Structure 1
């Protein structure tokens, strides 16, 4: 009574079978990649097959992202009685031998051309995944990447299939799944997904009717309540203070902060980033931007006038973010904006980089202000202007040199730079292709690397816009919502000379809710 798999040995066969499905799921290993596991070094004592490492239960902890490679290797040098330097060696040689499967990468490229939904489902650890993302170039063929170290789940547990089906909204009826390991294929079949076993010299194809029901939700009821509680919390805050409040102090957690609430920038940030604000709040906060007394001829000052220090200039950051939002909500025309954009091009320093302030007496640069200025440039038609070349290069170097790990002049948190960069790169992809992979690669390395809710939320948002599901940061984010539904205050940006952080519970809650939304 065991279901007899149809064998396949002709590309014509493989092709007709694959065409019968809307959605194809690849696993990386074997199907799309291969490598040499055995690797002898100048260390005679110990194991010789990296397979001993990958078969060890500690490896499950690495794949799920619970531990890193240094940790895994330290525990394995003990369990496997092999000098850890030899295992590190072995693991490196195996990684260096990785190559694509040329046949299946071509299948993958074609499937993507025929406008199919394609997902990558792989047990692979964060550090390896980051390296694979850099080394190969089929990732562009995937509609979504589901990696164990980003999920805290792993094949063959049904949990990972259940999260895949739910996350990607998959109709398992029209879904097939290509993998080498049988137990992964059996698990997916009990979910009603048809399987395609990749063998040495053939494919085993089991069509699966399925159509049975799904089990209990990993945390869905939890999530719906926390989202509602956060929404109620934030809508109440913003309806009472549509001019988004801020607090100041000398630390990122704003411990002991005092209420300031006289800068309009936070309001602009919230208008731009949380895409589910009720309409009355958008309008009420939009009203604030326009009537902001620090508007002078379509240029904005950070401060309200009453709070404006002596001789504090308009800045290209407030102005850029505001104009961009106005433009995008049909409250300003490109014709009115372009003259302001032109003042910005006239604000470059000796190195050609557009500067922060509308004031030649206050020369400053900042990578994120650069980014937000370029965003407005491309949004209005200026994307090919020659005067932007040096500014774009400043931002690219900031990324590639990993200089962003030290923060920007006004934004200390590295993920804030990656986040705003990801809006530019994703929203204007033709003009930013060379950024896409180094950006996605930095983000992969940073999954779950900090505890601050807003930072976790930024990484969730950016990686998802770039096609990668970051469930780990998601989970931890839920754990830090407080009982009233809001998240804790966060110092998004600083007055550098005085080391004054600025932030609000509203800022943290808005990005958190957006991150919960984007993975929903």
Structure 2
């Protein structure tokens, strides 16, 4: 070893710095008292129980864990909950380490957080403390279904972060964890009170190739993305519709590994005004208007692939800025006889605004305001006018927030937090895929939803059909297996 006790720079001798949260960045106290006299008085007796491991791996929540520990610890459940509340109220941030962490960030970053913490705890620590900004990737046990003593969680961080094991020193107060990091070749660093001792799957690939083959055959046979319509989100008993260009636009905009021949082909079916209608020209009702959602998404894609320029787009952008309701909010159609608003349509319009350099036009203030309130107020939990699913709002919101960093910083932590609480709260592959992508683009690895996504791939490579959007006048859903597969493969792509 080499006991350290003075301003050291042995750190700068390494490329990757991995932190644990406990003692190193956060300290708490475990003895607490309530009006109830029965049972344990030290929360560490819970934290050391084996049931606490289930809670750390995401396999149970705190309500479950506390009901079991009532039995095992012979303590009223309300007492354990209250001692747990008191324990986390004693949380104090180590301010030396936090300054040393802000420093490491300021330099050549490359800092990862790898802690054992249960999901609801990590949610609270995320929103209550402001040191996550210095982390390049957050690897939390509840998001991984992995617990720190086991070697497999160590193996996972080395693969996922793709870090040279020889250029790595990992900081902890537990010695068991230091030994296992040492096994893979990572230099270690104990954090005693006054001392700082120094020292120095293919199954995935099969399923990914399978699913890419499914999606390619489907979009080569139908470059115009098919769509089924039904009255439920699983589209059970859906009938073929296939007369709207929006599914094609959404696929082009979102899956990033599409072959060149498929991009050209679908991009051809779309160029068929510089404004676009929901419907295939063939299927469009007479005097049915163009909408800002199909237009925004397509223009953003054409601008992004350089098939079009800002000057080409500016006239349509002004038409959108002149499409505002009485409250100043940009509306869904170019049809003053059909005023509608929708938060996800607003996100997409604002997205193109920022793409073309119109991001600070005064006429956008009320439209961005509506999107922010729709998030903070938790209205998004009831869906938007055309998108029932709450993660779809969080998904499109995360694109605008991450892609224009300095123009949306007030959305960042609220949106990351909303996403963290929603980890693994639904079974639909498309919603899981959305959460994996968004969190990863926000710096948080969501391996739970990833694994359960792998499990729901049908044997032909594709994922089940999903009703991503809805016509509200009849609550008729639209979807395809193509859309589901397209986001699942994107989520597999962004995590491996």
Tell me whether the two structures share a fold, i.e. TM-score over 0.5: yes
Per the TM alignment, residue 14 of structure 1 is displaced from its structure 2 partner at its CA by 5.2
Per the TM alignment, residue 483 of structure 1 is displaced from its structure 2 partner at its CA by 0.5
Per the TM alignment, residue 429 of structure 1 is displaced from its structure 2 partner at its CA by 1.0
- The answer to whether the 8 Å contact 1:265/1:318 transfers is yes
Instruction: Quote the Cα distance in structure 2 between the aligned partners of 1:312 and 1:445.
Output: 40
Deviations 1:69-92 (A, max 9, x none): 111111111111111111111111
Per the TM alignment, residue 305 of structure 1 is displaced from its structure 2 partner at its CA by 2.1
| More divergent stretch after superposition (9-18 vs 178-187) | 9-18
Per the TM alignment, residue 407 of structure 1 is displaced from its structure 2 partner at its CA by 0.5
Residue 440 of structure 2: SS of its match in structure 1? helix
- The answer to whether the 8 Å contact 2:2/2:199 transfers is no
Per the TM alignment, residue 12 of structure 1 is displaced from its structure 2 partner at its CA by 8.4
Instruction: Quote the Cα distance in structure 2 between the aligned partners of 1:321 and 1:303.
Output: 15
Instruction: Quote the Cα distance in structure 1 between the aligned partners of 2:107 and 2:2.
Output: 22
Instruction: Quote the Cα distance in structure 1 between the aligned partners of 2:269 and 2:36.
Output: 69
**Which one of the candidate residues 103, 107, 128 is aligned to 1:110?**
103
Instruction: Give the match for residue 306 of structure 2.
Output: 330
Residue 111 of structure 1: SS of its match in structure 2? helix
Moved over 4 A (4+): 8-14
Deviations 1:339-386 (A, max 9, x none): 111111111111111111111111111110000000000000110011
Instruction: Give the match for residue 287 of structure 1.
Output: 268
Superposed, 1:20-31 pairs within 5 Å as: 20-31=13-24
Instruction: Quote the Cα distance in structure 2 between the aligned partners of 1:287 and 1:203.
Output: 62
| More divergent stretch after superposition (454-463 vs 35-44) | 35-44
Gaps of 5+ in 2: none
Instruction: Quote the Cα distance in structure 1 between the aligned partners of 2:287 and 2:92.
Output: 60
Residue 15 of structure 1: SS of its match in structure 2? coil
Per the TM alignment, residue 13 of structure 1 is displaced from its structure 2 partner at its CA by 5.3
Residue 236 of structure 1: SS of its match in structure 2? helix
**Which one of the candidate residues 213, 216, 221 is aligned to 1:232?**
213
Per the TM alignment, residue 308 of structure 1 is displaced from its structure 2 partner at its CA by 1.4
Instruction: Quote the Cα distance in structure 2 between the aligned partners of 1:170 and 1:454.
Output: 30
- The answer to whether the 8 Å contact 1:9/1:201 transfers is no
Residue 17 of structure 2: SS of its match in structure 1? strand
- The answer to whether the 8 Å contact 1:463/1:469 transfers is yes
Q: 1:206 to 1:40 in 2, by over 3 A?
A: same
Q: 1:267 to 1:308 in 2, by over 3 A?
A: same
Instruction: Quote the Cα distance in structure 2 between the aligned partners of 1:367 and 1:99.
Output: 38
| More divergent stretch after superposition (18-27 vs 33-42) | 33-42
Per the TM alignment, residue 94 of structure 1 is displaced from its structure 2 partner at its CA by 1.3
Per the TM alignment, residue 335 of structure 1 is displaced from its structure 2 partner at its CA by 0.5
Instruction: Give the match for residue 384 of structure 2.
Output: 408
Instruction: Quote the Cα distance in structure 1 between the aligned partners of 2:432 and 2:298.
Output: 25
TM, length-normalised to structure 2: 0.98
Gaps of 5+ in 1: 1-7, 208-219, 291-295
- The answer to whether the 8 Å contact 2:381/2:390 transfers is yes
- The answer to whether the 8 Å contact 1:27/1:120 transfers is yes
Instruction: Give the match for residue 94 of structure 1.
Output: 87
Residue 478 of structure 2: SS of its match in structure 1? strand
Per the TM alignment, residue 309 of structure 1 is displaced from its structure 2 partner at its CA by 2.6
Instruction: Quote the Cα distance in structure 2 between the aligned partners of 1:11 and 1:199.
Output: 10
Q: 1:339 to 1:91 in 2, by over 3 A?
A: same
Residue 78 of structure 2: SS of its match in structure 1? helix
Per the TM alignment, residue 306 of structure 1 is displaced from its structure 2 partner at its CA by 2.1
- The answer to whether the 8 Å contact 2:58/2:141 transfers is yes
How many residues get paired?
Answer: 496
Per the TM alignment, residue 142 of structure 1 is displaced from its structure 2 partner at its CA by 0.6
TM, length-normalised to structure 1: 0.94
Instruction: Quote the Cα distance in structure 2 between the aligned partners of 1:11 and 1:422.
Output: 42
Tell me whether 1:355 sits opposite 2:331 in the alignment. Answer: yes
Instruction: Quote the Cα distance in structure 1 between the aligned partners of 2:3 and 2:427.
Output: 51
**Which one of the candidate residues 245, 248, 263 is aligned to 1:267?**
248
Residue 120 of structure 1: SS of its match in structure 2? strand
- The answer to whether the 8 Å contact 1:9/1:202 transfers is no
Superposed, 1:29-48 pairs within 5 Å as: 29-48=22-41
Per the TM alignment, residue 289 of structure 1 is displaced from its structure 2 partner at its CA by 1.0
Instruction: Quote the Cα distance in structure 2 between the aligned partners of 1:251 and 1:426.
Output: 32
Deviations 1:131-187 (A, max 9, x none): 111011111101100000000001100010000000000111000000000000001
- The answer to whether the 8 Å contact 2:467/2:480 transfers is yes
- The answer to whether the 8 Å contact 2:5/2:194 transfers is no
Instruction: Quote the Cα distance in structure 2 between the aligned partners of 1:379 and 1:116.
Output: 28
Residue 374 of structure 1: SS of its match in structure 2? helix
- The answer to whether the 8 Å contact 2:278/2:294 transfers is yes
Instruction: Quote the Cα distance in structure 2 between the aligned partners of 1:399 and 1:268.
Output: 25
Per the TM alignment, residue 44 of structure 1 is displaced from its structure 2 partner at its CA by 1.1
Instruction: Quote the Cα distance in structure 2 between the aligned partners of 1:166 and 1:84.
Output: 40
Per the TM alignment, residue 424 of structure 1 is displaced from its structure 2 partner at its CA by 0.2
Instruction: Quote the Cα distance in structure 1 between the aligned partners of 2:257 and 2:5.
Output: 47
